[PDB]
């Protein structure tokens, strides 16, 4: 039976104890075990009735199921979602995650697995501390809890509890022989999670329990990441602890001052200037043992400035904010080394701030430096290219000139990122193949928007040649979307999703200029989709042939001139005339169609199914292939 | 421009533009037949540049558009035809104009290519709908509309 089990699961989810008893009445032991312990797929969850009853917190339901019927403690199934789709979790894990003391107490008294390990070794203690119920954590503790059992990423309950803002649970774990020196999969400790959380009480309890501060696998000590996250309170605690020496504390002060000028949430130039006072004074208070910071060459994005080595230069910027933000970014790169992922969001946000008030000259170079850092860090950067396309379309719409070297550099980074995404999806796993393909298609679309912008702007012959070479590299690479669409097919398709922020105001697809430029760059005119539609099949189905007759006419002219079989057949044996919805496109193609005896003879050969293997040249062997 | 202002009319009422956009215009066979082929896109564009009467009407009521849409080689010479049509549309030719038989240039196209080119070079133009409603209802439009609108209604 399936209906009775489904109704039992639904009643357990709803808490209908009378209905549950009615459904479970007059049932044998096998029937009792089948109705309680059957995995049902409801609401996106493959769960047993006991799992959904423990998750809902129904104490009466779970106690009836475990007392009168004695449901087994091996209720394994998929529970919850949003990064917590772990399968095989027992009812105790769900009860601890649900944050109901009565349910976990009843399950423990009934013999649930306290240290149960899931497919990702998710212990119930981790879920209990994630929910924040101290009583559940304790009740798990006295029932032979294993604090060594952690996630497969070496994430213990203490680390994830310190990540959240709950001091009571981390204090109870620390007094219950925790592991303050824990090391995660990335090398980060729970001290880093506490520092980025901004709760100084957790750090105080950790250092009271021999926290033993140390850098992570990447190389970011917790004081440094606390400084980067504008957590001044967390920074001003290790000085009281008195174990950060003098160079680490002063670079923490410098990074804190640099971060307050760039972080959007904690944007306050006053705090930046105050902590820069603190950094300068603590550097220049002794003289004999003066601590000096290194000098990096100036970066063209921030103008021409290398920190403020003389303090009087720092106090010379108390009347300005732009140079203060640039100095903060310079100091942030000097400390972080311009290699962590944390160096890109500040400069990107500064570029955005320069962009909202039409100061595009600084925004473009700031975002270009951020994009170069992202590319040199081997990080996904499709969003940065998308925002480049957006800002380029915005400044195009405002009738302001786009710098040709700027768009050339963006195109270079775009084709490099498309190569990176192509080789990433070449050997990607099934768990991430959909998102990898989505990123690849987003990179393709943003490349198309950039090419459309480059057609929109006016540049010299050298800049146009550079842009054409950058496009031709990708054209020779021959990128294909999940539907088999090449660059030409998307450039001639009206169904290409143009971004809604600013690109849709300028980049309109299909566009005659982008297709003409792609053909000049050597696009394969006779390409196919997965269903065989060439560029001509795609364009002839265009929805606005009257108002946009110029675009459709130019696309068809360019496609025919570059060489396109105007009677090529897709998998459904439909010529572009047979695929053309509008009569305007039909007659445009007929004007651009040249009668040929080779096509007529190939059509006759295909219709009569004459065997053309080795009887004709290979060129004809494919000519009848697509006719 | 001097010859256009002189207002040349053939015995059939064909103006300079009508003869420039007509494939029926006789051509001498000695050496002009080897170069001078009518209709010509360059000739029509040059005439329209020098203030030619774009909506000129012959005795039969036809215009330059009514003549060019009748062109019977709309593929091999299509480009020329295409250019001429847009040239007329670039010179303000009224695509809804009716001759003495009340036939729009769509009705005188007798060709798919010319009809489609004309349709794509034609706007909705609420003025055309209002003028057609005025003409169909036989409303008097004398001294009650602008001076140009009187000729505009006279087109239909």
């Amino acid at each position: 039976m399936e209906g009775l089990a489904g109704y039992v699961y639904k009643a357990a989810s709803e808490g209908k104890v009378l209905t549950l008893a009615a459904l479970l009445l007059n049932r044998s032991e096998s029937d009792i075990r089948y109705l309680l312990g059957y995995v049902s797929q409801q609401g996106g969850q493959r769960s047993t009735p006991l799992i959904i009853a423990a998750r809902n917190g129904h104490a009466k339901v779970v106690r009836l199921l475990l007392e009168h019927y004695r449901v087994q403690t091996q209720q394994t199934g998929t529970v919850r979602f949003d990064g917590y789709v772990i399968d095989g979790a027992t009812a105790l894990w769900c009860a601890a995650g649900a944050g109901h003391f009565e349910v976990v107490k009843l399950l423990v008294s009934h013999g649930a697995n306290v240290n149960h390990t899931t497919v990702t070794n998710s212990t119930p203690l981790r879920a209990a501390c994630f929910d924040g119920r101290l009583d559940i954590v304790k009740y798990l503790v006295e029932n032979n809890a294993n604090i060594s059992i952690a996630n497969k990423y070496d994430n213990t309950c203490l680390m994830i509890a310190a990540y959240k803002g709950h001091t009571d649970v981390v204090r109870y774990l620390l007094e219950q022989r925790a592991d303050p020196n824990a090391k995660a999969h990335c090398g980060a400790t729970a001290l880093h999670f506490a520092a980025e959380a901004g709760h100084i009480d957790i750090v105080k309890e950790l250092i009271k329990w021999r926290a033993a501060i140390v850098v992570n696998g990447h190389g970011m000590t917790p004081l440094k990441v606390a400084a980067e996250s504008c957590k001044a309170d967390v920074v001003e605690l290790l000085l009281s602890h008195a174990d950060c020496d003098r160079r680490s504390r002063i670079e923490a002060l410098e990074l804190l001052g640099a971060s307050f000028a760039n972080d959007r949430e904690n944007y306050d130039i006053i705090k930046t200037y105050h902590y820069l006072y603190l950094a300068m004074l603590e550097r220049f208070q002794d003289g004999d043992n003066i601590l000096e910071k290194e000098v990096l060459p100036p970066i063209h994005a921030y103008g021409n400035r290398t920190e403020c080595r003389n303090p009087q230069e720092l106090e010379s910027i108390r009347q300005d904010r732009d140079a203060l933000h640039m100095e903060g970014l310079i100091v942030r790169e000097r400390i972080l080394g311009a290699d962590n992922i944390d160096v890109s969001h500040p400069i990107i946000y500064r570029g955005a701030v320069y962009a909202d008030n039409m100061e595009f000259e600084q925004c473009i170079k700031l975002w270009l430096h951020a994009l170069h850092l992202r590319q040199k860090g081997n990080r996904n950067t499709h969003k940065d290219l998308l925002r480049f396309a957006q800002v380029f379309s915005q400044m195009i719409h405002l009738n302001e000139t786009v710098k040709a070297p700027d768009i050339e550099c963006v195109l270079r980074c775009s084709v490099l990122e498309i190569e990176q995404s192509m080789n990433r999806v070449k050997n990607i796993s099934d768990a991430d193949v959909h998102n990898a393909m989505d990123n690849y298609e987003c990179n393709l679309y943003t490349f198309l928007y950039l090419v459309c912008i480059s057609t929109k702007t006016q540049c010299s012959e050298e800049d146009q040649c550079k842009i054409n070479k950058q496009i031709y590299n990708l054209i020779h690479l021959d990128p294909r979307t999940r539907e088999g669409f090449t660059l030409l097919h998307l450039a001639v398709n009206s169904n290409t999703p143009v971004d809604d922020f600013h690109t849709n105001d300028v980049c309109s697809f299909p566009n005659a200029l982008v297709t003409k430029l792609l053909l000049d760059c050597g696009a394969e005119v006779n390409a196919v989709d997965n269903e065989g539609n060439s560029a001509l099949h795609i364009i002839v189905q265009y929805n606005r042939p009257i108002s946009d007759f110029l675009t459709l006419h130019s696309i068809i002219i360019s496609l025919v001139e570059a060489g396109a079989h105007t009677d090529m057949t897709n998998k459904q044996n439909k010529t572009p005339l047979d695929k053309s919805t509008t009569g305007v496109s039909e007659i445009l193609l007929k004007t651009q169609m040249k009668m040929s005896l080779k096509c007529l003879a190939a059509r006759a050969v295909r219709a009569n199914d004459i065997n053309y293997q080795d009887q004709i040249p290979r060129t004809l062997e494919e000519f009848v292939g697509f006719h | 421009y001097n010859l256009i202002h002189l207002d040349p009319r053939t015995r059939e009422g064909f103006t300079l533009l009508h003869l420039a956009v007509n494939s029926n215009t006789p051509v001498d066979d000695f050496h002009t037949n080897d170069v001078c082929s009518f209709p010509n896109a360059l000739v029509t564009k040059l005439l329209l540049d020098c203030g030619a009467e774009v909506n000129a009407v012959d005795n039969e009521g036809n215009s330059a558009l009514h003549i060019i849409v009748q062109y019977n080689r709309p593929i091999s010479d299509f480009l020329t035809l295409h250019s001429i049509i847009i040239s007329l549309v670039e010179a303000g030719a009224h695509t809804d104009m009716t001759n003495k038989q009340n036939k729009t240039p769509l009705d005188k196209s007798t060709t798919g290519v010319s009809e489609i080119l004309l349709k794509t070079q034609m706007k909705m133009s609420l003025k055309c709908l209002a003028a057609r409603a005025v003409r169909a209802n036989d409303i008097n439009y004398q001294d009650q509309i602008p001076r140009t609108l009187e000729e505009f209604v006279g087109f239909h």
Binding site: - | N137, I139, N140, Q144
Partner: protein, 95 residues
């Protein structure tokens, strides 16, 4: 593909909706434009109140009765106020 003229006393807003759409879509349109939230404004169809739930398909706004060339009229009333929409000016007679 249903086109409407939502008519205030003198304001006549020209809107578009799908045939299979509910009243609350155009109510949100009126809220976003006229700045009157739907909890205080009621619409009418040819002197008959419309409820928040029923769709435009069976409300009487078929695609054959509310073409763009002649949209259907939807009344309005802001707070009760009855349908007292002022009509258009009388056209002059044929001369």
């Amino acid at each position: 593909d249903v086109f409407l003229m939502i008519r205030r006393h003198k304001t006549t807003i020209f809107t578009d909706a799908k045939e299979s759409s509910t009243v609350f879509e155009l109510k949100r349109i009126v809220e976003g434009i006229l700045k009157r939230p739907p909890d205080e404004q009621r619409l009418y169809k040819d002197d008959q109140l419309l409820d928040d739930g029923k769709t435009l398909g069976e409300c009487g706004f078929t695609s054959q009765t509310a073409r763009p060339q002649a949209p259907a009229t939807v009344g309005l009333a802001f707070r009760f106020e009855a349908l007292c929409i002022e009509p258009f000016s009388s056209p002059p007679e044929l001369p």
